[PDB]
Amino acid sequence: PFFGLNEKIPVLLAFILGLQHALAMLAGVVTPPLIISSSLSLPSDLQQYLVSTSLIVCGLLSMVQITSGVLSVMGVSFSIISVASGAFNQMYSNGFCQLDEAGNRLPCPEAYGALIGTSACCALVEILLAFVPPKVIQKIFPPIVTGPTVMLIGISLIGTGFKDWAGGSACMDDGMLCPSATAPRPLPWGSPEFIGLGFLVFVSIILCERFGAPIMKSCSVVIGLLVGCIVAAACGYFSHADIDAAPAASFIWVKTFPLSVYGPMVLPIIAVFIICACECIGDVTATCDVSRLEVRGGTFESRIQGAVLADGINSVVAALATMTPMTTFAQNNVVIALTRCANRWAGYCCCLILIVAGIFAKFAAAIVAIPNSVMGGMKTFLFASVVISGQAIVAKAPFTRRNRFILTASMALGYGATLVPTWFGNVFPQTENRDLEGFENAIELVLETGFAVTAFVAMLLNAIMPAE
Amino acid sequence: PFFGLNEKIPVLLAFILGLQHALAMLAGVVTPPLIISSSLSLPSDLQQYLVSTSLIVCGLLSMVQITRFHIYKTPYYIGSGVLSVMGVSFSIISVASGAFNQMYSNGFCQLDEAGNRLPCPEAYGALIGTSACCALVEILLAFVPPKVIQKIFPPIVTGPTVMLIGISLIGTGFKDWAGGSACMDDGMLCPSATAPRPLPWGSPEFIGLGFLVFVSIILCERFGAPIMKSCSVVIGLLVGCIVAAACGYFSHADIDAAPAASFIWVKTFPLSVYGPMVLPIIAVFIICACECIGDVTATCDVSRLEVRGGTFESRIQGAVLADGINSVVAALATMTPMTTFAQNNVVIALTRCANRWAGYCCCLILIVAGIFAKFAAAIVAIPNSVMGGMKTFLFASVVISGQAIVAKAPFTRRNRFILTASMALGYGATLVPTWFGNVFPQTENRDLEGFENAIELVLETGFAVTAFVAMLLNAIMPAE
Ligand SMILES: CCCCCCCCCCCCO[C@@H]1O[C@H](CO)[C@@H](O[C@H]2O[C@H](CO)[C@@H](O)[C@H](O)[C@H]2O)[C@H](O)[C@H]1O
Ligand SMILES: CCCCCCCCCCCCO[C@@H]1O[C@H](CO)[C@@H](O[C@H]2O[C@H](CO)[C@@H](O)[C@H](O)[C@H]2O)[C@H](O)[C@H]1O
Ligand SMILES: O=c1[nH]c(=O)c2nc[nH]c2[nH]1
Ligand SMILES: O=c1[nH]c(=O)c2nc[nH]c2[nH]1
């Protein structure tokens, strides 16, 4: 029995589907804060804070776009991570941030502040380019451009999942419970126990699919995460100390970050917001097919415009609420499709469940206190799924010798751009300092980003290549 | 004017298209000897030898599968009777990485714990012995199983495996582009990185070289004439190598020091010698069988022929039979397993000619190129960076092609899930160095432990893992 958008359902059902959505998107909302924090800072205080903050903010802005007028689940984007890797690396290299003992980086919140200032800046850049360009964008970024970019995003990100899976990127410290690899500067090291953990998560997800009932759908990642986490607690991999030490409350601004602060990663941020625009379009349309609605009507394109507008608006809002850019989650469309319900009430239930979970900031702490390995397996599955979906996007464009060539050059040159650390030999080979050099550093940022390069090559070839 | 299989075409035309084919498959034939050799030994004698030897033997066994006049007497025949270009497979590299790694680790081969690995020809002899052994494992399983194999290795299983083969192999391409996997030595011309044990290090110049090769390929397509097709790779390689010579990246000393002759057994390798990588070899030949099937069918559609006829499947049977037969033949000739080259189907389609005379001219051109063993050395004398850009393009194309294979199956949540797990776990299996914690955690030595090492070999292999996960999931997962 398929449920339309606007109809009251048994409120128990609405709550339950709200829960399934909440759990489904949980991994996707939770993981990027963990990734950004670990790659910049240590304090568990701030991690618990940003997980709970994320939960609350995401609940709120999902509520904002659920009223688009169809189940429009919103959550933190994964593109901003791939940008921030290169960003932070340069901030620690030629930037202002500081280093210790050859490897260990000092937490540098001014970087995050720059990130939020810049992203808040360029969210506007996107909302103002959100107005009336629907099919045009579809033409400018076809699946032959779209697919490779996304594939390489998931690929370049999968490394961190595998690293945590290993037990990294920084192996456990002194006096901390259950060290099985203790060392400064081992990014991909870890003992067999860690492998077994992440693998048990992965296998847990797989079995979760094999014996998967309509509720367990899209929770398989989160359920696997949970299973591996329970086994983890059974073995003794936990820090109940920091769990106890965490506060059981969270307001949106318990902790705050620098303002009037921006970086030179402005353009990559703009690129991220474009990505989020295209993604929003695809995700919303998909929902419309899932929700048995119009797919080309004027009302449809109105839904898309509202979706993208609310997208960038909530990017600004989240930035003010100390959150990085966020976009449309695509897990839900599965849930809806298999549960036959696209009611706004499931989404709102979800939203409230999230905000509430964020308030009880012990859940956040329990999340931060999940071993790097369980997180590792779960995330590796996650990014793997991203790669696979980018590929599914690829296959929408006819595989001719032309498209195969364009994909080849874009993939290879993009990932090739990922491999290289940095460039210098031109304006900066002698370590020079001109007005350009500071934005030579910005060019370094774009160049270092893999998917940016991929997208540039794809668009360039599709432009200059002859029609087969 | 579309030219059929059997029609005399201007022998100038047949020769020229023979040349285009020769150049087309040149890179794909030449590269695996370079990769296996560099990853085992140093002597330029053996590299030049195996390059020219590869040219010769592939020409000969291409001649073996282009015709059916060799075996057909009464029953089903060998090999194919339409353009069936043959050349050394890339699966054997992906296997030989882990294989050789285990041979230098727990095997007999030696190292001196200071700089590069000692050359170990007995490893190659084991490789060849084992592969020659299992080519027979594939030919006798080459008899009458056509659509069956298609069902056992559908696109959902087929595609990921190929992708990961391409992925885990591409690393050597990038490494060479950088200037590796061992940066240039002392007194050797144009060292820009000299060091023991830097596998992916290298200066800007190396980047510039390989990148000029790659850019040369792209520009070769951009201004590409029908002859330059599938030569774009070899043309880019050539361009970047010319530029390389211009900068001064050349070793005319070893080029001069090379012999201008090459017979099939100028140099030889151990016999009665096998490793424990037998099963990985069987996997290689399964790969090559399916590969033959798909490549041939592609050719039949290119050459305007039957696609479901009995004659068609007869052609396939012959293709796989000649595949494994030429695998044994090549192995006796000190060559690794070889299978059907798929570049050609483009050329034909773009040249409207599937004449066996293009193929035979090609073959002769290759064998002749192999005899003149100064070309072989000229190939060996290409900087690792030029080689790098070119090979990188090659493997990237392998991955993408595996993906095109993938897309043949309806992208459902089921198929997406299976792809996800298969890719992730295969590549993860690639990441880990080795396992021990069970039968060998205490460094034990029982009768099993030696083939515990074989399980270690398959386990280390990325695509084998990928495929096992893929098939197991596709089996036990319910139909969506
Ligand atoms: C230096 C230059 C920088 C230039 C930067 C510009 C980058 C532009 C890249 C485009 C981004 C790709 O945007 C992509 O859009 C498609 C639809 O088109 C979304 O949608 C795709 O995947 C989702 C799964 O989650 C499906 O629901 C959908 O049917 C499919 O098309 C992708 O999830 C998103 O990743
Ligand atoms: C531990 C377990 C070990 C068991 C290992 C088993 C591995 C077997 C993997 C199957 C190998 C993949 O085999 C694959 O077959 C397809 C057809 O399906 C071939 O063909 C595919 O690509 C070629 C391009 O080159 C196209 O011409 C063709 O149309 C396409 O189908 C591929 O070139 C080959 O790579
Ligand atoms: O789980 C997720 N689903 C998504 O759609 C998405 N987009 C960015 N980041 C995301 N994470
Ligand atoms: O150039 C190549 N093309 C191929 O299809 C192939 N298969 C194995 N080895 C190969 N080399």
Residue numbers in the entry:
A (entry chain B): 66 to 132, 145 to 545
B (entry chain A): 66 to 545
Publication passage describing the model:
Nucleobase–ascorbate transporters (NATs), found in almost all species from bacteria and fungi to plants and mammals, are responsible for cellular uptake of essential metabolites.
A thermostabilized construct of UapA with a single-residue substitution, G411V, and lacking the N-terminal 11 residues (UapA-G411VΔ1–11)17 was expressed in Saccharomyces cerevisiae as a green fluorescent protein (GFP) fusion protein. The structure in complex with xanthine was solved by single isomorphous replacement with anomalous scattering and refined at a resolution of 3.7 Å to an R-factor of 29.6% and Rfree of 32.7%. Density consistent with xanthine is visible in a clearly defined binding site approximately halfway across the membrane in a cleft formed by the half helices of TMs 3 and 10, similar to the uracil-binding site in UraA. The current structure confirms many of these earlier predictions, revealing xanthine is within hydrogen-bonding distance of the side chains of Gln408 (TM 10) and Glu356 (TM 8), the main chain nitrogen of Ala407 at the N terminus of TM 10 and the carbonyl oxygen of Val153 preceding TM 3, as well as the main chain nitrogen of Phe155 of TM 3. The phenyl rings of both Phe155 and Phe406 pack onto the xanthine. The residues directly interacting with the xanthine are all from the core domain and in the structure a detergent molecule packs over the xanthine separating it from TM 12 of the gate domain. The xanthine is fully accessible to the inward-facing side of the protein through this detergent-filled cavity. However, the UapA dimer structure reveals that this residue lies in close proximity to the xanthine-binding site, but of the opposite monomer.
